Design a protein around this ligand. Structure first.
Ligand SMILES: Nc1ncnc2c1ncn2[C@@H]1O[C@H](COP(=O)(O)OP(=O)(O)O)[C@@H](O)[C@H]1O
Lengths: 57, 140, 602, 457, 23, 169, 447
């Protein structure tokens, strides 16, 4: 009964702590999403064509 | 233990489609309401006429339930109830007994270790022998 | 023609390069856009094959290969002492300072001697404008350290008339500290000279070797003595003591400088040296000083690139030959010639050359031969006469511990001293783990001329000690099938005395203050006492076994237990605290105690 | 910065031979770059370029070559060496031998990509290791002390409980914050469960990373398995200042992977058919250990290996013995008598015990006690070897006391429970209670001052 | 064995090269 | 006593597995956010390709980037049907810039017999004249290549810097 | 399709126009269709290690590729079969050829065609139903004991487009049709699986139940678990039959597989004579044990690759039965003879020797075989458990366990029933030396 009584709450503690961590993730995400999104779009769209440095003649 | 990701998600959508077949087969009338509620999250993906590809995308997308351990436990409980209800074929049992035995299995640690499964295996051997039995005193 | 070719191909440390028509074997090359240091090893037309001294991961076909026009070479000059160099001569201290990294960055080009430092230079005063000069002439002294007066000298290829010698002052490697002319051609010189490491620095004469290299250790200096200018090996299995002996010779010897080569060694050994050697001190002129001031390292740890093990050895002996030409008694440690030979095995396996025994290249014998023969005592080149030396100690690490190993077999073919260690002794914690049966020192006949002048008692004592240990090992082969009881009392005395010699003379605990170092006067004093006990114990039996009043080993033991305790205790006497006269007086009292105790049995 | 150039993919498989696929027409091949191969059936595989020569790239394929095809195989060249994605989020996680996750978590969201080979730690920046770790095991902590930053392997005969000793060290290890990277090469699944279970039972998951390569997983992954573990340990120690312990399990299964690859490559063989470079490759694993200047971090290593046919002279233990800072030995001569943990002190040494002992670290006596216990146990084995020929009637009373010491020693010093944790100070008091079996004057390895301070107490 | 095998591979290379030299 | 140890063991198992499940749920959630950033990047790019001005600038680069990786005397460019008119302009600009920088001629054809799938967001593939070697310059491939390499920068923004990473060795 | 022979030297056949061929693909060489594996590719050319004697193969002969690596036909009709190491059916070769010899280049289909088996479709399935690898789509009544669970191949998946009604069907009848990504797969009772690939699982479970042998020493003092890995020092003087026959008659495994690894001609015929005559009581009826086994027999002059493959064939069969949720026991009556066949392949490939002349990968080829044992949750949806237990005999020369095949085996197997000639000479049957013998499963069986 002591083991069952301790199991009768600790799942809610780790789940609440998970939902807290998920909120902290969501916060830092939304605070930066548009900046990161624009930066990846810029790095992808700036092509910079290059010949391999070992090319000859 | 492990699998290729395509294998893993293929097994997920398999187990969903099988839970649905078992649920329809144990109950063609939707009388087992408390049991059906404990599978609604998987049953919806088979009651909706989705293609295997569409449920596979939903599995890779985490919209389908996709833990193979949870699906195997949940599938096991259902089919071992299906074996009970199918084993007693000439004597259809009462709905309250079905939901009671379901609750006892749901509460159990591991159905393969349970004496519940041992009893059904002993019944299966005895019943399966009768299916093709020739007339003789022992068989009668 | 092009100064640079192009990489044709790569396989581990081996690179092949195109557009190499007009390259030379053993010419240095820079491979890859990061300029990885490498050396040409084979020629195949307009194509070269190269050995790279840095990890080739990431080299591509068509990468540049800049030919340098130079062979593998070391800069010799001020700024060597206290340094630690990698296998191709880059100072790890300046690599660390310039890059702030815990790792050596691949392709780094840190100049071998720190050209920003201003060194103090005194010109030789004899030399002046118009003076004659030749290779090996000491044209000045640089006060590099409190110990090492760095005798700057004209390079061995150079000669002529002095055009200009710089005044006393402060200078660096870019300064024209000397200028010559020869055949109408001027030649600017500075206190740093380049030399090709695979080439032997010449000498006026290779002299016979006739002064002992006092090591830190009783068993070495007594039973298997090394000589200054001597060639030595320390073959031993893993965990025998070979590094601790190489450390102990470096920490405690009469070598005026040490070059220590960490060739393929476990990395903690380099950190042990750099941790301990600034703290440990010698003394000169009544001033205490850090032993680092007389030492230089060439590291190339086991995980550093395989090829660089060759360069590491050749760098270490090139440095050692330079300090020898200054007239210093150099010692060179090499932490394993087998881990060097494994670099020669790897290059051979990449080149697909035919192996001799155990995969080693057939030239392994010649590589080792042309290494150990760089030792000796020498009349240096050039005007002032000097008696330099290099003593070389190669700590061979035979695979499986087995001395049939081709590197051990070739090494023992060349070296005049063989300190064969033994895992049976190291398992017993008998350290230093020297097996005194299989070991030898060919220099003993030359060193007898030194012992006869300074230690006239020693040659008899060395002889008797070796004989007693041999007789116990002869007796042991019988004891192992009959037990301890059947032996004659003289032979019991031999066995017990040999056990005292084994446990309280051959063993020496170098991590404890009393055994950290053991001077020759302590070493011979212990022998004089143990052999005086042996002769008197044997004599007491032989004098009385002709009668019923027979003295025996057990009578001696039970009457002399305090003298046996005193005998075993002699190792604990400590030159750091006890004066030489105090240790000698205690040992003289033990000799008198033995004589009066034996007179009390008669 | 990122490589901006787009990747080439080749179908120009000019041949396949053993574990090698030989591409041709490759534009500027890069030695040791990684190839991703798609087979005709759409199976993905990976490989590393072992040689380049003009247009040719010889790629070794990690999953093996079974099913590679001279026409229908697409080899994407990534243009770069193999980099491990690393982050601190790799603690509490499980990876296969190629570093793909198998804990049902996502891929490693990297804080950085590190070259799997690491970098050679500069000998000037390497700190000499000296702070002691208690393992909790008396045969280690009392006579083979492990320094913080040491590498010291557990040798074992085949089928000995070496996994249990290594698990116990993970449970009980501490100073007189910490993390583990555990790797196993070619471990059987029955043993893989034991290791994963033990970290879950000890609550250790939040500070351990597991790499599992199972005994049926593709044998070339064993070459990268400890390299991935080290590359994670290097991130955690040298960038994150964690106090890391790396466990590498059956370095024999690693050495077998070297022997198999060596056979396939046709390298010059050393002893027992291992490659001639086995020392360097083992050094490239083992030397990624120790403390580094300016960093509070440290990589400790305790590799484990099964000595083939129990032979200490076998190349696997022998080259490991040259590279590692002493070794801890486990023995059938203890295990058959049920002496857990079956650690045999006599062949054992720890090179750093000559520093990670004495004042501020351990009691003053420790060095002396250890040396005298070694002498008494060694003499005990020698008189046992005499008894086997001539019988105990030939032994002296002193010799019989060394034989009785060897019995009492194994029964109390070595013998210890699988969860029993002993301090070094407790281990030394046991050491003295054993040394007290002899008369004081026989203790020839201990100074008179240490005897006067500790022998009667 | 290893020496004889490496010799056999060099011979096969020399044979293949000798046939290519006919072109 | 054995039964008491079994109860304590059952508690330890349950107390344990909950923490592992929590740690994995957090990890999955973080990765799903990063994955959704990449999904929004794929959407943003899928808007950019509708502007024929920026999309011509992309194809001018992507084609020439292909040519500079293959360096052959003959090549084949593959695109979607809708891309072809822009790709023709891109090839016609790229052949000059190829010959200028490489100092050598090239023949390039567009693979109008065998287009890219309409599911591709845009960009091109390029092949050798024998089709035995290829280079990928489809816009989704470019995104994956840079996005995978930039995962550290993405993590360092979307979840902030790790406070423990005091050294960059 | 086919290539042409370009050259032959002993069993090595070089073929050309093989540009479409794959490493370890299985090829038929010559007008007689001799079997062999591609061991190298070098362009449009392939080098084939032909298994059978190549005498009479000619330049320009056809070289027909199979679309598969070395693989086992799996399906109904395995029970009672006798196979060589490469799954060729020795009983049916005998009955069709009417010869005392295997003809060089047999092409007899491994599972006998034309036998219409009684099939019952899995009554839950419908057109449009979802299915995944390891789903049991019907049951075949091949024998009284072993209801053969037909299952979807592990790599196949999709929606059922058709399933055959209850009836009689042979192995080439299309029993199932399914679709995925708009692509139809037609499917038979015969299923082909690559023999050197592990059949995948939902999970390998920890092994926790005794494999009861019905033998006091074996069950009491040295227990082997269901799923266990074990060895026996199989040699004449020790009486090895005492274990293997007892397991075959009584033990709690639903199916058995025998591999003759490379046994002496007459010792092979002892196995093949004996097992047909052995019987079990089931439900109070008496039936031949050949109702529940297959004998992968190989005499020492069977092709080297067949001996080396024979071990992998037996386990690939055993894994199919494991995936049916049966507990298989697999006997391997001389792992040493298999290791000799492996050594011969390495010698013919001109690979470098390692320990005692064995190849470097002997340790891996043994370990990756014994790791194919264990209990499992099968693939596919009816959640069924199953296992393979591997009982792999060893033959150390003079009893010397330092022999690398023996030492590596004892480095892997968790149980060793150390039979001893000293006990067998005294008739102390079952002749197990209890000082030598051991089991590591004691802890796991405590539950
Ligand atoms: N003279 C010594 N005094 C005390 N301990 C020693 C001595 N020589 C060796 N040992 C001990 O033995 C260990 C193993 O020998 P070592 O020299 O370190 O190994 P190796 O021979 O392989 O280089 C040493 O680290 C030290 O702990």
């Amino acid at each position: 009964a002591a083991a069952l009584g301790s199991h009768g709450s600790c799942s809610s503690e780790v789940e609440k702590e998970t939902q807290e961590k998920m909120t902290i993730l969501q916060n830092y995400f939304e605070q930066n999403r548009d900046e990161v999104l624009d930066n990846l779009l810029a790095f992808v769209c700036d092509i910079r064509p290059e010949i391999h440095e070992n090319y000859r003649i | 233990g492990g699998l290729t990701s395509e294998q893993y998600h293929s097994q997920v959508v398999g187990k969903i489609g099988y839970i649905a077949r078992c649920m329809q087969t144990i109950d063609p009338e939707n009388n087992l309401k408390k049991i059906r509620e404990d599978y609604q999250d998987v049953l919806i993906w088979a009651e909706k006429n989705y293609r295997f590809e569409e449920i596979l995308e939903a599995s890779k997308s985490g919209k389908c339930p996709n833990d193979l351990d949870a699906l195997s436990r949940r599938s096991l409980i259902l089919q071992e109830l299906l074996r009970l209800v199918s084993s007693i074929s000439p004597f259809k049992m009462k709905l309250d007994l079905i939901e009671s035995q379901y609750e006892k299995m749901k509460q159990h640690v591991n159905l393969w270790k349970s004496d519940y499964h041992v009893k059904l295996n002993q019944l299966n051997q005895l019943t399966d022998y009768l299916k093709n039995a020739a007339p003789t005193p022992k068989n009668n | 023609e092009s100064t640079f070719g192009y990489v044709h191909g790569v396989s581990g440390p081996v690179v092949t390069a195109c557009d190499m028509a007009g390259a030379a074997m053993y010419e240095l090359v820079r491979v890859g856009h990061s300029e990885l240091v490498g050396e040409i090893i084979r020629l195949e037309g307009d194509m070269a094959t190269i050995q790279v001294y840095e990890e080739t991961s990431g080299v591509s076909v068509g990468d540049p290969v800049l030919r340098t026009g130079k062979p593998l070479s070391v800069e010799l000059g001020p700024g060597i002492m206290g340094a630690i160099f990698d296998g191709i001569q880059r100072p790890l201290s300046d690599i660390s300072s310039q890059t702030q990294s815990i790792y050596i960055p691949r392709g780094v080009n840190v100049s071998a001697l720190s050209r920003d430092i201003k060194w103090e230079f005194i010109p030789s005063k004899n030399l002046r404008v118009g003076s004659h000069i030749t290779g090996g002439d000491i044209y000045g002294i640089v006060n590099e350290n409190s110990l090492i007066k760095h005798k700057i000298m004209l390079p061995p290829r150079s000669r002529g008339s002095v055009t200009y010698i710089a005044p006393p002052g402060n200078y660096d490697a870019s300064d024209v500290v000397l200028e010559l002319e020869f055949e109408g051609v001027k030649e600017k010189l500075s206190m740093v000279q380049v030399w090709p490491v695979r080439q032997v620095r010449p000498v006026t004469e290779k002299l016979p070797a006739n002064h002992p290299l006092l090591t830190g250790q009783r068993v070495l200096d007594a039973l298997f003595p090394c000589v200054q200018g001597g060639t030595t090996a320390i073959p031993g299995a893993f965990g025998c003591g070979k590094t601790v002996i190489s450390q102990s010779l470096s920490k405690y010897s009469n070598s005026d400088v040490i070059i220590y080569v960490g060739c393929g060694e476990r990395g903690n050994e380099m950190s042990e040296v750099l941790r301990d050697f600034p703290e440990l001190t010698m003394e000169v002129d009544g001033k205490v000083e850090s032993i680092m001031k007389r030492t230089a390292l060439v590291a190339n740890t086991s995980n550093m690139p395989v090829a660089a093990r060759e360069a590491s050895i050749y760098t270490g002996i090139t440095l050692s030959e330079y300090f020898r030409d200054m007239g210093y008694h150099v010692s060179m440690m090499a932490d394993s010639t087998s881990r060097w030979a494994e670099a020669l095995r790897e290059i051979s396996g990449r080149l697909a050359e035919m192996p001799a025994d155990s995969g080693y290249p057939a030239y392994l014998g010649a590589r080792l031969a042309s290494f150990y023969e760089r030792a000796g005592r020498v009349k240096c080149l050039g005007n002032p006469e000097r008696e330099g030396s290099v003593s070389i100690v190669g700590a061979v690490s035979p695979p499986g511990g087995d001395f049939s190993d081709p590197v051990t077999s070739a090494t023992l073919g060349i070296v005049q001293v063989f300190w064969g260690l033994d895992k049976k002794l190291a398992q017993r914690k008998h350290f230093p783990s020297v097996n005194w049966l299989i070991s030898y020192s060919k220099y003993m006949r030359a060193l007898d001329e030194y012992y006869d002048k300074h230690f006239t008692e020693f040659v008899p004592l060395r002889t008797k000690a070796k004989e007693i240990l041999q007789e116990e090992e002869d007796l042991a082969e019988i004891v192992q099938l009959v037990g301890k009881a059947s032996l004659a009392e003289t032979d019991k005395i031999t066995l017990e005395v040999a056990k005292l010699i084994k446990d309280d003379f051959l063993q020496q605990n170098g991590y404890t203050p009393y055994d950290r170092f053991c001077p020759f006067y302590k070493t011979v004093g212990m022998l004089s006492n143990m052999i005086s006990f042996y002769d008197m114990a044997r004599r007491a039996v032989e004098t009385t076994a002709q009668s019923d009043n027979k003295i025996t080993w057990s009578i001696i033991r039970e009457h002399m237990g305090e003298i046996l305790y005193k005998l075993s205790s002699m190792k604990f006497k400590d030159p750091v605290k006890d004066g030489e006269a105090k240790i000698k007086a205690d040992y003289a009292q033990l000799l008198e105690d033995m004589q009066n105790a034996f007179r009390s049995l008669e | 910065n990122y490589l901006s150039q787009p990747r080439l993919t080749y179908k120009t498989v000019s041949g396949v031979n053993g574990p090698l696929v030989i591409l041709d027409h490759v534009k500027f091949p890069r030695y040791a770059e990684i190839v991703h191969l798609t087979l005709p059936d759409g199976t993905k595989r990976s490989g590393q370029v072992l040689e380049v020569s003009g247009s040719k790239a010889v790629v070794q394929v990690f999953e093996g070559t079974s099913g590679i095809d001279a026409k229908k195989t697409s080899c994407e060249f990534t243009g770069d060496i193999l980099r491990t994605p690393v982050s601190e989020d790799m603690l509490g996680r499980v990876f296969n031998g190629s570093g793909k996750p198998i804990d049902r978590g996502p891929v490693v969201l990297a804080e950085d990509f590190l070259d799997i080979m690491g970098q050679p730690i500069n000998p000037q920046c390497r700190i000499y290791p000296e702070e002691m770790i208690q393992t909790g095991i008396s045969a280690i902590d009392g006579m083979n002390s492990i320094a913080r930053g040491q590498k010291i392997p557990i040798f074992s005969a085949a089928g000995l409980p070496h996994n249990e000793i290594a698990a116990q060290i993970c449970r009980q290890a501490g100073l007189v914050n910490f993390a583990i990277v555990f790797a196993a090469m070619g471990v059987n699944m029955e043993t893989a469960r034991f290791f994963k279970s033990d970290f879950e039972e000890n609550g250790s998951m939040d500070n351990v990373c597991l790499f599992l390569n199972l005994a049926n997983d593709p044998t070339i992954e064993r070459i990268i398995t400890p390299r991935l573990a080290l590359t994670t340990a290097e991130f955690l120690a040298y960038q994150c200042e964690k106090h890391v312990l790396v466990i590498l399990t059956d370095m024999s299964s690693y050495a077998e992977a070297l022997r198999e690859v060596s056979a396939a490559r046709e390298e010059v063989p050393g002893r027992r058919g291992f490659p001639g470079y086995m020392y360097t490759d083992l050094a490239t694993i083992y030397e990624r250990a120790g403390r580094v200047e300016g960093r509070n971090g440290s990589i400790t290593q305790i590799p484990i290996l099964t000595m083939p046919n129990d032979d200490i002279t076998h190349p696997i233990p022998d080259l490991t013995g040259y590279i590692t800072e002493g070794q801890i030995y486990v023995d059938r001569q203890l295990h058959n008598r049920q002496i857990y943990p079956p650690i045999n002190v006599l062949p054992s040494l720890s090179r750093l015990m000559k520093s990670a002992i004495g004042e501020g670290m351990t009691r003053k006596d420790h060095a002396d006690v250890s040396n005298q216990l070694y002498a008494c146990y060694a003499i005990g084995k020698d008189v046992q070897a005499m008894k086997a020929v001539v019988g105990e009637e030939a032994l002296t009373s002193d010799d019989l006391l060394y034989l009785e010491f060897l019995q009492k020693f194994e029964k109390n010093f070595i013998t210890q429970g699988p969860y029993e944790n002993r301090t070094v100070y407790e281990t030394l008091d046991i050491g003295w209670q054993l040394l007290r079996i002899f008369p004081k004057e026989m203790l020839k390895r201990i100074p008179q001052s240490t005897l006067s301070e500790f022998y009667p107490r | 064995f290893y020496r004889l095998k490496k010799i056999q591979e060099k011979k096969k290379i020399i044979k293949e090269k000798s046939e290519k030299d006919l072109e | 006593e054995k039964k008491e140890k079994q109860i304590e063991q059952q508690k330890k198992i349950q107390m344990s597995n909950l923490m592992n499940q929590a740690r994995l749920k957090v990890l999955r959630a973080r990765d799903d956010l990063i994955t959704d950033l990449l999904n929004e990047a794929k959407q943003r790019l899928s808007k950019v390709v509708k502007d024929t001005t920026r999309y011509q600038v992309l194809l001018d680069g992507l084609v020439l980037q292909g040519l500079y990786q293959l360096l052959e005397p003959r090549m084949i460019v593959r695109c979607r049907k809708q891309d072809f008119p822009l790709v023709k302009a891109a090839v016609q600009k790229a052949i000059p810039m190829y010959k200028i920088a490489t100092k050598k001629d090239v023949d390039v054809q567009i693979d109008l017999e065998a287009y890219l799938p309409e599911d591709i967001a845009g960009g091109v593939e390029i092949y050798n004249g024998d089709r035995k070697i290829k280079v990928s310059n489809t816009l989704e491939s470019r995104l994956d290549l840079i996005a995978q390499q930039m995962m550290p920068e993405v993590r360092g923004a979307l979840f902030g810097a790790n406070a423990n990473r005091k050294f960059l060795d």
